[PDB]
Amino acid sequence: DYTLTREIVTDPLNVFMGKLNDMVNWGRKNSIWPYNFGLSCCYVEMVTSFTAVHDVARFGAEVLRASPRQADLMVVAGTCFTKMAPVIQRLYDQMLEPKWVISMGACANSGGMYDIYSVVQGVDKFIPVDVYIPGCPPRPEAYMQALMLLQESIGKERRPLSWVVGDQGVYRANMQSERERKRGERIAVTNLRTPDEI
Amino acid sequence: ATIHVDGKEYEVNGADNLLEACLSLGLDIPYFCWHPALGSVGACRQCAVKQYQNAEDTRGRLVMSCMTPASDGTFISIDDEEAKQFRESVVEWLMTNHPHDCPVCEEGGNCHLQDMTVMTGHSFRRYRFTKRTHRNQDLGPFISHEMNRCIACYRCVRYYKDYADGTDLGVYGAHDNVYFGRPEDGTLESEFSGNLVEICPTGVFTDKTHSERYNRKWDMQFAPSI
Amino acid sequence: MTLKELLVGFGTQVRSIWMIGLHAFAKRETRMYPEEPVYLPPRYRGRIVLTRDPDGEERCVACNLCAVACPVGCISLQKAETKDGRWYPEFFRINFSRCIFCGLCEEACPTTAIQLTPDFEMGEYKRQDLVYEKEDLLISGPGKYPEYNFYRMAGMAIDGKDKGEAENEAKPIDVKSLLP
Amino acid sequence: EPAWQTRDHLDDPVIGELRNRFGPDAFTVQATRTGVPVVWIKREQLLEVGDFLKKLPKPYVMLFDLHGMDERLRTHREGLPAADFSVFYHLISIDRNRDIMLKVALAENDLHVPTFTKLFPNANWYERETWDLFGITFDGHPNLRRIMMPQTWKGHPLRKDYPARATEFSPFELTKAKQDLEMEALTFKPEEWGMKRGTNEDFMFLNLGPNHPSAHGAFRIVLQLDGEEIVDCVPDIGYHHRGAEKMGERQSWHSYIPYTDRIEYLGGCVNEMPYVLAVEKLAGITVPDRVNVIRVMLSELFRINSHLLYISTFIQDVGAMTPVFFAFTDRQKIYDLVEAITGFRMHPAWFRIGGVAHDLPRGWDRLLREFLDWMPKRLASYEKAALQNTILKGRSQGVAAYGAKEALEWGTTGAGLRATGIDFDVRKARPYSGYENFDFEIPVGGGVSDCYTRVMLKVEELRQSLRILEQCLNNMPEGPFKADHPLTTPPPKERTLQHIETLITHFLQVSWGPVMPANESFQMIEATKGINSYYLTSDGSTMSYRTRVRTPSFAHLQQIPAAIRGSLVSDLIVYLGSIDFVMSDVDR
Ligand SMILES: CCCCCCCCCCCCCCCCCC(=O)OC[C@H](COP(=O)(O)OCCN)OC(=O)CCCCCCCCCCCCCCCCC
Ligand code: SF4
Ligand code: SF4
Ligand code: SF4
Ligand code: SF4
Numbered sequence A: 001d002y003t004l005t006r007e008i009v010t011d012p013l014n015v016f017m018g019k020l021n022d023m024v025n026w027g028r029k030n031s032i033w034p035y036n037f038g039l040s041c042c043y044v045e046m047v048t049s050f051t052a053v054h055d056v057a058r059f060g061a062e063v064l065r066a067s068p069r070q071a072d073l074m075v076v077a078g079t080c081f082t083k084m085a086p087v088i089q090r091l092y093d094q095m096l097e098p099k100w101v102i103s104m105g106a107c108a109n110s111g112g113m114y115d116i117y118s119v120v121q122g123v124d125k126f127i128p129v130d131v132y133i134p135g136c137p138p139r140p141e142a143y144m145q146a147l148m149l150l151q152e153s154i155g156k157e158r159r160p161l162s163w164v165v166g167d168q169g170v171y172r173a174n175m176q177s178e179r180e181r182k183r184g185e186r187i188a189v190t191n192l193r194t195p196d197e198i
Numbered sequence B: 001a002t003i004h005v006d007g008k009e010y011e012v013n014g015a016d017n018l019l020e021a022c023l024s025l026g027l028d029i030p031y032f033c034w035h036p037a038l039g040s041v042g043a044c045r046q047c048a049v050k051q052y053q054n055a056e057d058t059r060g061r062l063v064m065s066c067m068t069p070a071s072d073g074t075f076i077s078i079d080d081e082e083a084k085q086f087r088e089s090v091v092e093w094l095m096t097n098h099p100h101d102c103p104v105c106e107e108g109g110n111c112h113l114q115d116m117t118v119m120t121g122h123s124f125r126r127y128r129f130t131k132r133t134h135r136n137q138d139l140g141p142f143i144s145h146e147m148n149r150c151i152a153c154y155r156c157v158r159y160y161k162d163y164a165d166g167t168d169l170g171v172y173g174a175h176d177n178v179y180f181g182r183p184e185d186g187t188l189e190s191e192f193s194g195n196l197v198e199i200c201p202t203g204v205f206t207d208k209t210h211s212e213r214y215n216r217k218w219d220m221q222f223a224p225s226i
Numbered sequence C: 001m002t003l004k005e006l007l008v009g010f011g012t013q014v015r016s017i018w019m020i021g022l023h024a025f026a027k028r029e030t031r032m033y034p035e036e037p038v039y040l041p042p043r044y045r046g047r048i049v050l051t052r053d054p055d056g057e058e059r060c061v062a063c064n065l066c067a068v069a070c071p072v073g074c075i076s077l078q079k080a081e082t083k084d085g086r087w088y089p090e091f092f093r094i095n096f097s098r099c100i101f102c103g104l105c106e107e108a109c110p111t112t113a114i115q116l117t118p119d120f121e122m123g124e125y126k127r128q129d130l131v132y133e134k135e136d137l138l139i140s141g142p143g144k145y146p147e148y149n150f151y152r153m154a155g156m157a158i159d160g161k162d163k164g165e166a167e168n169e170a171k172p173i174d175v176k177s178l179l180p
Numbered sequence D: 001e002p003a004w005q006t007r008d009h010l011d012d013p014v015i016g017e018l019r020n021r022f023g024p025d026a027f028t029v030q031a032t033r034t035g036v037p038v039v040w041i042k043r044e045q046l047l048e049v050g051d052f053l054k055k056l057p058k059p060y061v062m063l064f065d066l067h068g069m070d071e072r073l074r075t076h077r078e079g080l081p082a083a084d085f086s087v088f089y090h091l092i093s094i095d096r097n098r099d100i101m102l103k104v105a106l107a108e109n110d111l112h113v114p115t116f117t118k119l120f121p122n123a124n125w126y127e128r129e130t131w132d133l134f135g136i137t138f139d140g141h142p143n144l145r146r147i148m149m150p151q152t153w154k155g156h157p158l159r160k161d162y163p164a165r166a167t168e169f170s171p172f173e174l175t176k177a178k179q180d181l182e183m184e185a186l187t188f189k190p191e192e193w194g195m196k197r198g199t200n201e202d203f204m205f206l207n208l209g210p211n212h213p214s215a216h217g218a219f220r221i222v223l224q225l226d227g228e229e230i231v232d233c234v235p236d237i238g239y240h241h242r243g244a245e246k247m248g249e250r251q252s253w254h255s256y257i258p259y260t261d262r263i264e265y266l267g268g269c270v271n272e273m274p275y276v277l278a279v280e281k282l283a284g285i286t287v288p289d290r291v292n293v294i295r296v297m298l299s300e301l302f303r304i305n306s307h308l309l310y311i312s313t314f315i316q317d318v319g320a321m322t323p324v325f326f327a328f329t330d331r332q333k334i335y336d337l338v339e340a341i342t343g344f345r346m347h348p349a350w351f352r353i354g355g356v357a358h359d360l361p362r363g364w365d366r367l368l369r370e371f372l373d374w375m376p377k378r379l380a381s382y383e384k385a386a387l388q389n390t391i392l393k394g395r396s397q398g399v400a401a402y403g404a405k406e407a408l409e410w411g412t413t414g415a416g417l418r419a420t421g422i423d424f425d426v427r428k429a430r431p432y433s434g435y436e437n438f439d440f441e442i443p444v445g446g447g448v449s450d451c452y453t454r455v456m457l458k459v460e461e462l463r464q465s466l467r468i469l470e471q472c473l474n475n476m477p478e479g480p481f482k483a484d485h486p487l488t489t490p491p492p493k494e495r496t497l498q499h500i501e502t503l504i505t506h507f508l509q510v511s512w513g514p515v516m517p518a519n520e521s522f523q524m525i526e527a528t529k530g531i532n533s534y535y536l537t538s539d540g541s542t543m544s545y546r547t548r549v550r551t552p553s554f555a556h557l558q559q560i561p562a563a564i565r566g567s568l569v570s571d572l573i574v575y576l577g578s579i580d581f582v583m584s585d586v587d588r
């Protein structure tokens, strides 16, 4: 199942064009350059994931461009303040295709604990989001898990190989929800370690 | 009339008792058995204050504010240490038999006993023995009955019989085994039986119709209506 | 600059280069997520679950203390009752797109039903899928508190626990009893 | 008499001096739990009183805080002058080691005060924020514009009749504000920003934006440049405004603690400490010694965490990109201990009214000992590899220098103040949380506060915090982790789970909230980035009537134009790296 941006359609996928699409998806998902954009404390956890103890470079996602033109991924890591929302929208508009969005933390997801006069209640009110990370802040490995989720989403999307030939629509896979995928293992948990120890 | 509460002068009605006079002045005195519409009986012994004979008196004595007239030139203290200790002790005595029921009790968050337990500052249990237990009665489709939570404040019987002139609710037994309810299972016959859920300061008498779809008071959306 | 300043500066540059090369001779301090699992201490505040008593019944009595203690207001539930009188949540939903994992709901729970568990991996594609209902929260055991049972303490009678059968409870004495 | 008792401080010599100078009927003394003399002054005598306090033999040299209060819904104002609104002025005499709060009452129709900017230059931003959030005008202000909200904002959010919650999102207003951003440079005029003599036709105006995110946050600086030289600059802040004080009026006393954590998001339990101390003053709670030692240990661990981030990010801003990796590994060791104790990394929310959330887990001392063995070699390596490099020294020494007088007139605290030679640390001058039982030193500078001296002073502060942590590890008292007070929120969990009166107290504390009797309390601490204070007004309810948070980064960012004038832009970015600020602290 796929969603088309030019509706819910089926898979549009010759066998050489499928291999070319897989090669392009592999190259895109293994080379994701985030935009260096810091809103709040969630950005501290993101750049913590960039350091030696986590080494997000191992996934090939450490380049951290200062220009939106050179960046493939916008991580909204922090609160979408009302004064900063036009800035976020302009920076997202300055990014070039293909571009993906990770909303990081409760503030970027929904406004979080800041249901307040000066805060936009979630970045998905005005820009589309590919992966959401709950947490306040999410720990750096949660950001890495969301990066891997984005890689799985990229690895099965369909985009035009060229802008002069073929279908120009962007097809995104309707992936199974992580909640429903992990429900079988999560409900089966019985005992946990007592909180009196280290 | 002129009263002096904790060294502060107040003008009150002399025909009132000290509890309703001090509550009308905004002062906080814990109370259970008194109600504004039912009068004073001095049962629960919660409303203790220290009354002095005159201004130059430091000993005083503990009196019931609901049973003491707010007469002219009356010197009392609410925040006296012995009065506070006795009020905390009364709450503690009520707490000895009280069931561990607040999460599953419809009165929670709307409970006068909870409010007065917090108000007296009693939060540490040193009683270690058993709690008395009661069986409940079926009171019809409107009122749910839970006698474990009773503090024997006699508000229900005073309202139901002396105020509403009902006949099928009463108090039975003696000492710490006093029971409040009907002589047998059956629907409460009074047309004004539903006021028990607000008259009772605990969760003994509760709204069964609300209990079906229960939610706490803080979660409600209220409006003034007719 | 002076000649001494230039020479001392060159020496400090050489020292910096040497120390970073010796760092290249050192041991890696990288925790290799995801192949190496993240160690989480037992009281780590991650994914929220609802737990069961040692008898196997769900611990939640739908007392709504967690929902009001939530500063974000991302818990919604409704009380329901069994035929024997046991309170339980008819539904229980948590908006994890709003939740800040502060642990105040677990702190406020008087039955130890709701618990924050050491699980951080909670990323999602659609925000609507971050609304966890009761079937996504209720787990098969007691979680972090293995033995606590609220209904063994409560005075309210339920199935298998009559009046006078809770802890520190005497048997009910009828007012019609012959003993003075 | 306990330290939280209500006092009027009439024995303070400043009260007698004011009575001798202005007369007994000129002012009203209010009894508070703030720990300072609170004096209500007539509006027409405010400048005279401020000048008199500034010219005392041991003078009040720093305007610590200046803000407002909407008193219209306050029901317990006994002994207070009639006031629809009020403006308070917290002033500090370091030589006296004393402070005074001055309060000016205002009617609803006459909402104007004389400006304090001629006596104290940090009153500029303080009065701009008071105008923005309360609508109180200050006569004689050089440019009284909004500082938190955008200029096209309707209403004053800290007023009691302003709705706290978020309004409905609209793409049209986002489009309009995007258009204002797009033609902001085209229609830029220096006059509305307080700038002057621009476009001479030799200066340029250049805007800085969210392009260098060194974990401080998003804000703007517009620079007036003669070629490469800064002749004037104003910071544009409020891009990180979260409405935290308004949220203080929106949450219970217990449920506001996670919001305290996010005021200065590199501080954690350091941010929690002044709030819980001020609430405990309101509640009349004296915490036991084990609580004091646990809270000190958590505060010092988070101070080391914040200092590690600050030093490594300064080194990265200078140009050396390597030590940030190792310093974040050290931050992970701290996080190992903090995760084990509190269950969380950056915002533990672990302090409680009356204590802490749990007891220390078994095995905490092993992790603390491991960190205390790990840290010193790493710190020495950072010093030798980066802080003793002459290129870093040439980039930082003598850059954005100020002395003691400039630090005092701008409210600069923390390492920036102590680098000027003024020995003022709250943990020694006004000890709190049992800090007087610990042996540690306060590093001070030679008299001049550069980027380099501030960074090295924070390095010595890190070493002193390691000493305090060693003392915490060696002498941790046995006892309770929560006070034996009825307002300890929540009560101990095991008694809650088996005792009915404790369960009742827990039930009402977590749902409706603990009832704090009507009073005003104040607590000042030495935070990671300077002096952080909470000023809490309770109107007898389960929520704060007013939560005022004084943060040091606000004062430091206001000091920026005075210190960086006549320098280059490279000096400005190095200065921003050496300030130790975050935008959450600035905007709250
Ligand atoms: C062919 C392949 C190999 C090529 C090799 C290239 C490198 C040159 C040869 C080896 C040089 C070894 C230098 C050893 C430096 C030892 C490290 C050290 O301790 O340096 C710091 C020290 C000053 O210590 P201190 O003042 O405490 O500094 C901390 C406060 N900032 O600093 C000092 O005490 C300074 C000591 C003298 C350093 C210079 C020695 C003579 C160099 C002659 C050539 C000129 C180089 C520079 C020319 C630049 C011109 C543009
Ligand atoms: S979600 Fe929490 S940690 Fe992230 S920006 Fe918001 S307050 Fe900070
Ligand atoms: S009657 Fe009041 S104190 Fe007793 S269980 Fe119910 S809510 Fe708790
Ligand atoms: S049932 Fe209620 S009203 Fe009647 S005596 Fe008991 S506590 Fe009082
Ligand atoms: S952890 Fe905090 S934010 Fe999340 S549901 Fe519990 S109380 Fe609410």
Ligand code: SF4
Residues within 6 Å of the ligand: B103, C059, C060, C061, C062, C063, C064, C065, C066, C067, C077, C105, C108, C109, C110, C111, C112, C113, C114
């Ligand atoms: S606080 Fe616990 S028992 Fe009460 S409603 Fe929440 S999860 Fe259920």
Ligand code: FES
Residues within 6 Å of the ligand: B019, B030, B031, B032, B033, B034, B041, B042, B043, B044, B045, B046, B047, B064, B065, B066, B067
């Ligand atoms: S209210 Fe006075 S004794 Fe009961």
